[PDB]
Design an enzyme around this catalytic site. Structure first.
Site, PDB file in Angstrom:
ATOM      1  N   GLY A  45       0.834  -1.190   0.000  1.00 32.19           N
ATOM      2  CA  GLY A  45       0.000   0.000   0.000  1.00 32.19           C
ATOM      3  C   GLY A  45       0.875   1.248   0.000  1.00 32.19           C
ATOM      4  O   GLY A  45       1.973   1.238   0.553  1.00 32.19           O
ATOM      5  N   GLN A  50       3.194   9.940   0.951  1.00 30.13           N
ATOM      6  CA  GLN A  50       4.374   9.163   1.311  1.00 30.13           C
ATOM      7  C   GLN A  50       5.506   9.400   0.309  1.00 30.13           C
ATOM      8  O   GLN A  50       6.645   8.996   0.543  1.00 30.13           O
ATOM      9  CB  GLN A  50       4.037   7.674   1.406  1.00 30.13           C
ATOM     10  CG  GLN A  50       3.272   7.309   2.673  1.00 30.13           C
ATOM     11  CD  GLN A  50       2.938   5.825   2.753  1.00 30.13           C
ATOM     12  OE1 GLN A  50       1.979   5.352   2.133  1.00 30.13           O
ATOM     13  NE2 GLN A  50       3.736   5.080   3.515  1.00 30.13           N
ATOM     14  N   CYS A  95       4.288  -0.094   7.762  1.00 31.48           N
ATOM     15  CA  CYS A  95       4.183   1.057   6.860  1.00 31.48           C
ATOM     16  C   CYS A  95       5.546   1.433   6.271  1.00 31.48           C
ATOM     17  O   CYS A  95       6.556   1.437   6.982  1.00 31.48           O
ATOM     18  CB  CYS A  95       3.611   2.254   7.635  1.00 31.48           C
ATOM     19  SG  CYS A  95       3.330   3.770   6.670  1.00 31.48           S
ATOM     20  N   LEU A  96       5.567   1.739   4.971  1.00 36.47           N
ATOM     21  CA  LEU A  96       6.796   2.130   4.285  1.00 36.47           C
ATOM     22  C   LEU A  96       7.380   3.413   4.869  1.00 36.47           C
ATOM     23  O   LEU A  96       8.579   3.680   4.732  1.00 36.47           O
ATOM     24  CB  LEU A  96       6.536   2.337   2.785  1.00 36.47           C
ATOM     25  CG  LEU A  96       6.366   1.074   1.942  1.00 36.47           C
ATOM     26  CD1 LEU A  96       5.911   1.411   0.539  1.00 36.47           C
ATOM     27  CD2 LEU A  96       7.682   0.359   1.892  1.00 36.47           C
ATOM     28  N   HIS A 137      -5.992   2.204   6.522  1.00 35.60           N
ATOM     29  CA  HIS A 137      -4.627   2.654   6.768  1.00 35.60           C
ATOM     30  C   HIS A 137      -4.249   3.710   5.737  1.00 35.60           C
ATOM     31  O   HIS A 137      -3.851   4.814   6.092  1.00 35.60           O
ATOM     32  CB  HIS A 137      -3.668   1.463   6.683  1.00 35.60           C
ATOM     33  CG  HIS A 137      -2.223   1.815   6.862  1.00 35.60           C
ATOM     34  ND1 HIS A 137      -1.481   1.376   7.938  1.00 35.60           N
ATOM     35  CD2 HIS A 137      -1.359   2.485   6.061  1.00 35.60           C
ATOM     36  CE1 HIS A 137      -0.225   1.756   7.791  1.00 35.60           C
ATOM     37  NE2 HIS A 137      -0.124   2.429   6.660  1.00 35.60           N
ATOM     38  N   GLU A 138      -4.396   3.386   4.456  1.00 38.70           N
ATOM     39  CA  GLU A 138      -4.030   4.341   3.419  1.00 38.70           C
ATOM     40  C   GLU A 138      -4.824   5.641   3.505  1.00 38.70           C
ATOM     41  O   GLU A 138      -4.250   6.726   3.392  1.00 38.70           O
ATOM     42  CB  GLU A 138      -4.178   3.719   2.030  1.00 38.70           C
ATOM     43  CG  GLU A 138      -3.180   2.598   1.741  1.00 38.70           C
ATOM     44  CD  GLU A 138      -1.749   2.963   2.115  1.00 38.70           C
ATOM     45  OE1 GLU A 138      -1.359   4.134   1.921  1.00 38.70           O
ATOM     46  OE2 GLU A 138      -1.008   2.071   2.591  1.00 38.70           O
ATOM     47  N   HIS A 141      -3.540   8.145   5.846  1.00 36.53           N
ATOM     48  CA  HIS A 141      -2.442   8.966   5.332  1.00 36.53           C
ATOM     49  C   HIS A 141      -2.932  10.258   4.696  1.00 36.53           C
ATOM     50  O   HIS A 141      -2.306  11.302   4.865  1.00 36.53           O
ATOM     51  CB  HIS A 141      -1.613   8.204   4.302  1.00 36.53           C
ATOM     52  CG  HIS A 141      -0.579   7.307   4.902  1.00 36.53           C
ATOM     53  ND1 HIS A 141       0.386   7.765   5.772  1.00 36.53           N
ATOM     54  CD2 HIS A 141      -0.350   5.982   4.747  1.00 36.53           C
ATOM     55  CE1 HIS A 141       1.166   6.759   6.128  1.00 36.53           C
ATOM     56  NE2 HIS A 141       0.742   5.667   5.519  1.00 36.53           N
TER      57      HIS A 141
HETATM   58  C1  LIG Z   1      12.781  -3.146   7.291  1.00 37.30           C
HETATM   59  C2  LIG Z   1      11.406  -3.344   6.736  1.00 37.30           C
HETATM   60  O1  LIG Z   1      10.883  -4.442   6.746  1.00 37.30           O
HETATM   61  O2  LIG Z   1      10.834  -2.222   6.246  1.00 37.30           O
HETATM   62  C3  LIG Z   1       9.518  -2.231   5.683  1.00 37.30           C
HETATM   63  C4  LIG Z   1       8.350  -2.120   6.538  1.00 37.30           C
HETATM   64  C5  LIG Z   1       7.025  -2.097   5.954  1.00 37.30           C
HETATM   65  C6  LIG Z   1       6.852  -2.191   4.532  1.00 37.30           C
HETATM   66  C7  LIG Z   1       5.442  -2.105   3.896  1.00 37.30           C
HETATM   67  C8  LIG Z   1       4.282  -1.695   4.503  1.00 37.30           C
HETATM   68  C9  LIG Z   1       2.979  -1.536   3.773  1.00 37.30           C
HETATM   69  O3  LIG Z   1       2.932  -1.763   2.555  1.00 37.30           O
HETATM   70  N1  LIG Z   1       1.851  -1.135   4.427  1.00 37.30           N
HETATM   71  C10 LIG Z   1       0.609  -0.982   3.640  1.00 37.30           C
HETATM   72  C11 LIG Z   1      -0.608  -0.572   4.490  1.00 37.30           C
HETATM   73  C12 LIG Z   1      -1.124  -1.813   5.236  1.00 37.30           C
HETATM   74  C13 LIG Z   1      -1.115  -1.868   6.660  1.00 37.30           C
HETATM   75  C14 LIG Z   1      -1.590  -3.034   7.335  1.00 37.30           C
HETATM   76  C15 LIG Z   1      -2.075  -4.143   6.599  1.00 37.30           C
HETATM   77  C16 LIG Z   1      -2.088  -4.090   5.177  1.00 37.30           C
HETATM   78  C17 LIG Z   1      -1.613  -2.930   4.502  1.00 37.30           C
HETATM   79  C18 LIG Z   1       8.022  -2.311   3.707  1.00 37.30           C
HETATM   80  C19 LIG Z   1       9.343  -2.331   4.260  1.00 37.30           C
HETATM   81  O4  LIG Z   1      10.466  -2.445   3.380  1.00 37.30           O
HETATM   82  C20 LIG Z   1      11.231  -1.358   3.024  1.00 37.30           C
HETATM   83  C21 LIG Z   1      12.349  -1.693   2.092  1.00 37.30           C
HETATM   84  O5  LIG Z   1      11.060  -0.183   3.404  1.00 37.30           O
HETATM   85 CO   LIG Z   2       1.299   3.586   5.413  1.00 31.75          CO
END
Ligand SMILES: CC(=O)Oc1ccc(/C=C/C(=O)NCCc2ccccc2)cc1OC(C)=O
Ligand SMILES: [Co+2]
Length: 166
Positions: A45, A50, A95-96, A137-138, A141
């Protein structure tokens, strides 16, 4: 092209994004860059702020059975608005913009939203579980809200500890 991901505690993430009014080639390229940016960082997401764009649009691409993401199932939601919400559940979120931290947050287990696709077409979508969580969640933001803001007393402390840990 890849876009820089904005990380907490940047004040930019507290911005209230504005409605999109022109669905043109420029908007479409931003959406493509957003997708390219989300995948490169392995997220599922991503909201416009962001990546520095104060616009009310976000993308969500949940992985399938195989566990892989197919750009075909990618949702592009612009100018979203909740029509109805119901139930309650806890979901461990990530979350990214807050890399390395994951914590349970209380969300509605079911939501019905109204929005527009990149071609300005109006859509109504009902969701539950994971998809309903990503949507909430999105959308948070777009209103300058991060999931760490919704953490209970205890979990907030854990966040600060782990934050000081990095
Ligand atoms: C070190 C590490 O793992 O970092 C991260 C943390 C989160 C994420 C992604 C999170 C994400 O896509 N969240 C979307 C919203 C969501 C929240 C809860 C359930 C569904 C959707 C990616 C990472 O990797 C990098 C390279 O930054
Ligand atoms: Co987020």
């Amino acid at each position: 092209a890849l876009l820089e991901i904005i990380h907490y505690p940047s004040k930019i993430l507290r911005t209230i994004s504005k409605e999109v009014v022109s669905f043109d080639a420029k908007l479409h390229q931003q959406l493509d860059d957003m997708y390219e940016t989300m995948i490169a960082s392995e997220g599922i997401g991503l909201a416009a702020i962001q990546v520095g764009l104060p616009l009310r649009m976000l993308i969500i691409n949940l992985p399938q059975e195989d566990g892989v993401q197919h750009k075909e199932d990618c949702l592009e939601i612009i100018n979203p608005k909740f029509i109805e919400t119901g139930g309650s559940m806890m979901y461990k979120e990530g979350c990214l913009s807050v890399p390395g931290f994951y914590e349970e947050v209380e969300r509605f287990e079911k939501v019905k939203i109204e929005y527009q696709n990149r071609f300005a077409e109006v859509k109504v979508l009902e969701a539950s579980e994971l998809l309903a969580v990503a949507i909430q969640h999105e959308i948070d933001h777009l209103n300058g809200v991060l999931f760490v803001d919704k953490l209970s007393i205890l979990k907030r402390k854990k966040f600060e500890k782990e934050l000081k840990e990095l």
